[PDB]
Design a binder for this molecule. Structure first.
Ligand SMILES: *[C@@H]1O[C@H](CO)[C@@H](O)[C@H](O)[C@H]1NC(C)=O
Lengths: 97, 110, 93, 132, 49
């Protein structure tokens, strides 16, 4: 568990790093198990949250195990805690506004 | 004919700073990528600056430039004898629906 | 007869011998003209490969995955299979 | 990357011209050829140009109708034909392509009738034409 | 009676094998139909509260 602080607007980066570096399937969630991001093969897969048109992942970094989360346009309610599901590493990382 | 208003010829001392101010319209500078080409008279023309600030392999870093609104400049430092060439201002213009080059600017040194 | 067996669907390894024989099928059959695969080791670079790219017909045919010498393939013939867990009707093939 | 042409030619008013510009890569579809001239004493002028990966072709304002331009798919070459040869056309002809690989990084569907001619790099040796 | 589906044809696709875009030829000229059987679904939940 880590703490990452951003104020507003700029693109934060939240990273869960795998231990294989061969693009295994990951996911992202929040404190209500609402999906945010997620690999599906070699594509992306959004979710029906309030961060649908904002968050994105850098696709070139997946081959080295890095699965970031780039949330642009930080709104006033973006202080929550998001998890990864890579293999079992449910790394809950929180945010602030 | 010069739809992009380029100066016809410039002159400076070798090693100094000279800027070619190629201006145009709002349909070829502000919403299009401009580029420059260098040709000694009798040689094959070749680009020196693309994507408004970039240098290909074989081009020194003494050449630079900008793309400011309806105008596009050239940062040309380090003048020598071997840059005795005509410099052009080429970009796409969707209003004419064609690529349009500039009037050509010939630099010369002492 | 009378063989029950805990099958599995999500941990098979005939799947990975299919996913890397269809990747190898679409590399000799659908050759793109420009292919921007990344190749980098924060800042990264993207490459660009180019092959001769003609248009060819493409109709998938059925492919059987036979067993090599020394092994055998089971077959969960239970007509209401959950996918995982025990499968009470099992035949060899 | 190489880009070679045919040789210099002489013409007559009423005839046509068949100048080629043959590539060096595997195919033409990775490059966006153009066709620029250079009148003596003056600068250059973009006459025509072809993009084979979208099947499009673009022209200037003046040279429409007189110029047809065809890229042969087999031997990796592009032609440039022109009729109505008058004495103002006495110039050297240059073929120059660039990389079409930047259009893919645009978002989703792109303009398939549009043009992406920018930053030509592989300028050919130049074919000098004259009419008599 | 039947439902229509406003499809498209792409030339700049993300391929499924690896990461990285492909770029293909222009489409063929004439008619190209394909009859096929939708024997499957891949759904996905959305578990709220
Ligand atoms: C679709 O299903 C019908 C009946 O199940 C079958 O006859 C037909 O061959 C199928 N189409 C295919 C396999 O393309």
């Amino acid at each position: 568990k880590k703490v990452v602080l951003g104020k507003k607007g700029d693109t934060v980066e939240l990273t869960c790093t795998a231990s294989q570096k061969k693009s295994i399937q990951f996911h992202w969630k929040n404190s209500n198990q609402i999906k945010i991001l997620g690999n599906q093969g070699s594509f992306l897969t959004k979710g029906p949250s309030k961060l649908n048109d904002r968050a994105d992942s850098r696709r070139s970094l997946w081959d080295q195990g890095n699965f970031p989360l780039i949330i642009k346009n930080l709104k006033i309610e973006d202080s929550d805690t998001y998890i990864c599901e890579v293999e079992d590493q449910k790394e809950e990382v929180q945010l602030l506004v | 004919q010069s739809i992009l208003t380029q100066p016809p010829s410039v002159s400076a001392a070798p090693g100094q700073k000279v800027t070619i101010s190629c201006s145009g319209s709002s349909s070829n500078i502000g919403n299009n990528d401009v580029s420059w080409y260098q040709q000694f008279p009798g040689t094959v023309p070749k680009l020196v600056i693309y994507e408004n600030n970039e240098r290909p392999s074989g081009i020194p870093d003494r050449f630079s430039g900008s793309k400011s609104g309806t105008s596009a400049t050239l940062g040309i430092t380090g003048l020598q004898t071997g840059d005795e060439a005509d410099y052009y201002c080429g970009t796409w213009d969707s209003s004419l629906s064609a690529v349009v080059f500039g009037g050509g600017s010939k630099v010369t040194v002492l | 007869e009378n063989v029950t067996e805990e099958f599995n669907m999500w941990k098979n390894n005939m799947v990975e011998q299919m996913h890397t024989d269809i990747i190898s099928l679409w590399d000799q059959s659908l050759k793109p003209c420009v292919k921007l695969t990344p190749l980098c080791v924060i800042n990264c670079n993207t490459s660009a490969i180019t092959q001769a790219c003609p248009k060819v017909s493409f109709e998938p045919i059925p492919i059987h995955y036979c067993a090599p010498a020394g092994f055998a393939i089971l077959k969960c013939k239970d007509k209401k299979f959950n996918g995982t867990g025990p499968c009470p009707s099992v035949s060899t093939v | 990357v190489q880009l070679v042409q045919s040789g210099a030619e002489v013409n007559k008013p009423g005839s046509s011209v068949k100048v080629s510009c043959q590539a060096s890569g595997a195919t033409l579809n990775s490059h966006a050829f153009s066709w620029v001239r250079q009148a003596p004493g003056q600068g250059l002028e973009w006459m025509a140009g072809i993009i084979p990966i979208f099947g499009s072709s673009h022209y200037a304002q003046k040279f429409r109708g007189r110029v047809t331009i065809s890229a042969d798919e087999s031997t990796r070459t592009v032609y440039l034909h022109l009729r109505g040869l008058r004495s103002d056309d006495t110039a050297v002809y240059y073929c120059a392509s660039n990389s079409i690989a930047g259009v893919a990084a645009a978002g989703d569907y792109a303009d398939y009738d549009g043009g992406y001619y920018y930053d030509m790099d592989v300028w050919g040796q130049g074919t000098t034409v004259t009419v008599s | 009676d039947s439902i229509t589906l406003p499809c498209r044809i792409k030339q700049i696709i993300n391929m499924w094998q690896r990461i990285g875009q492909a770029m293909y030829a222009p489409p063929i000229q004439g008619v190209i139909r394909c009859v096929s059987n939708i024997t499957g679904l891949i759904l996905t939940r959305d578990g709220g509260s």
